[PDB]
Design an enzyme around this catalytic site. Structure first.
Site, PDB file in Angstrom:
ATOM      1  N   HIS A 269       0.830  -1.202   0.000  1.00  0.00           N
ATOM      2  CA  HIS A 269       0.000   0.000   0.000  1.00  0.00           C
ATOM      3  C   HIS A 269       0.869   1.260   0.000  1.00  0.00           C
ATOM      4  CE1 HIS A 269       0.623  -0.590   4.381  1.00  0.00           C
ATOM      5  NE2 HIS A 269       0.426   0.710   4.494  1.00  0.00           N
TER       6      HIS A 269
ATOM      7  N   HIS B 208       1.462   3.878   2.120  1.00  0.00           N
ATOM      8  CA  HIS B 208       2.140   4.490   3.263  1.00  0.00           C
ATOM      9  C   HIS B 208       3.655   4.378   3.117  1.00  0.00           C
ATOM     10  CE1 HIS B 208      -1.622   4.189   6.052  1.00  0.00           C
ATOM     11  NE2 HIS B 208      -1.559   5.358   5.442  1.00  0.00           N
TER      12      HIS B 208
ATOM     13  N   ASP C 110       6.081   3.380   4.780  1.00  0.00           N
ATOM     14  CA  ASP C 110       6.810   2.187   5.204  1.00  0.00           C
ATOM     15  C   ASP C 110       6.772   1.084   4.147  1.00  0.00           C
ATOM     16  OD1 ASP C 110       4.049   1.950   5.662  1.00  0.00           O
ATOM     17  OD2 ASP C 110       4.355   0.355   7.138  1.00  0.00           O
TER      18      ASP C 110
ATOM     19  N   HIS D 285      -6.596  -1.725   6.638  1.00  0.00           N
ATOM     20  CA  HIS D 285      -5.618  -0.768   7.144  1.00  0.00           C
ATOM     21  C   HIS D 285      -5.596   0.460   6.242  1.00  0.00           C
ATOM     22  CE1 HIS D 285      -1.767   0.904   8.559  1.00  0.00           C
ATOM     23  NE2 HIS D 285      -1.476   1.030   7.277  1.00  0.00           N
TER      24      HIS D 285
ATOM     25  N   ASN E  64      -1.848   2.524  13.492  1.00  0.00           N
ATOM     26  CA  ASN E  64      -2.200   3.666  12.661  1.00  0.00           C
ATOM     27  C   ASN E  64      -3.427   3.379  11.805  1.00  0.00           C
ATOM     28  OD1 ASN E  64      -1.180   4.954   9.556  1.00  0.00           O
ATOM     29  ND2 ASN E  64      -1.986   6.211  11.232  1.00  0.00           N
TER      30      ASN E  64
HETATM   31  O   LIG Z   1       1.953   1.710   7.222  1.00  0.00           O
HETATM   32 ZN   LIG Z   2       0.139   1.848   6.444  1.00  0.00          ZN
HETATM   33 ZN   LIG Z   3       2.191  -0.073   8.574  1.00  0.00          ZN
END
Ligand SMILES: [O-]
Ligand SMILES: [Zn+2]
Ligand SMILES: [Zn+2]
Ligand SMILES: [Cl-]
Ligand SMILES: [Cl-]
Ligand SMILES: [Zn+2]
Length: 230
Positions: free
Chosen positions: A83, A85, A87, A148, A179
């Site tokens: 995804h 994000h 990270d 998420h 998160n």
């Molecule tokens: O993340």
């Molecule tokens: Zn994420």
């Molecule tokens: Zn994450």
């Protein structure tokens, strides 16, 4: 045990854990919100290597590629971000520079662009609708629906029965929601069930963060998210 924890890995460094033949995870650490957080990914031998997600940072991703050559010695040629994000797409530039063809779904590429994160080059087709599955080398890419994040994907290794769930799956040590800023708490439980129902034969489940386990991670995550919901 012997999976490396948050301790056991200094920041900036990366370590590999062989789950099965031609299947590894790469573990990195990062300081955010004032706590050292670990982060998992996946490495699958493709005859060359297929990478799943960066090591949470440009410096960590450079250590990742360095560690791969030191201990595996096969070239990474393709990478997929689960995804948008940071990270998961953080380090895509380092991968691109090294000659790796980076991939991600159209939704993820867009949301990463909007967020201002590194944008993977290639667009993965056929993951737009909830329950969509595609083949990308030795793995199957599956979109369980919003969880998420609205765009998160999960990776399955049909040759090793390994199911990498990304941040959509919590480890057992996590009791509360992490998160959930861009998360869909309403659709998360339904999405986890799509994974359960589509991959009931997964032996090893790799969460986005922490120790791996079995399919018991799914309803655990369901228990956490539902508790957070109320
Ligand atoms: O993340
Ligand atoms: Zn994420
Ligand atoms: Zn994450
Ligand atoms: Cl290419
Ligand atoms: Cl390319
Ligand atoms: Zn290319």
């Amino acid at each position: 045990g012997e999976y490396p924890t948050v301790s056991e890995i200094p920041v900036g460094e990366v370590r590999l854990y062989q789950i099965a033949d031609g299947v590894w995870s790469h573990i990195a650490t990062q300081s955010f919100d004032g706590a050292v957080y670990p982060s998992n990914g996946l490495i699958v031998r493709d005859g060359e290597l297929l990478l799943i997600d960066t090591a949470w940072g440009a410096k960590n991703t450079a250590a990742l590629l360095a560690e791969i050559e030191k201990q595996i010695g096969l070239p990474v040629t393709r990478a997929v971000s689960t995804h948008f994000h940071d990270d998961r797409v953080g380090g895509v530039d380092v991968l691109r520079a090294a000659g790796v063809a980076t991939y991600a779904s159209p939704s993820t590429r867009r949301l990463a662009e909007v967020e201002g994160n590194e944008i993977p080059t290639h667009s993965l087709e056929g993951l737009s609708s909830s329950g969509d599955a595609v083949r990308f080398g030795p793995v199957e890419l599956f979109y369980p629906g919003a969880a998420h994040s609205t765009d998160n994907l999960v990776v399955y290794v049909p040759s090793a029965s390994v199911l990498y769930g990304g941040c959509a799956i919590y480890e057992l040590s996590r009791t509360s929601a992490g998160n959930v800023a861009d998360a869909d708490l309403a659709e998360w439980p339904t999405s986890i069930e799509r994974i359960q129902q589509h991959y009931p034969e997964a032996q090893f489940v790799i969460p986005g963060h922490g120790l791996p386990g079995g399919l018991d991670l799914l309803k655990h995550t369901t228990n956490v998210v539902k508790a957070h919901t109320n």
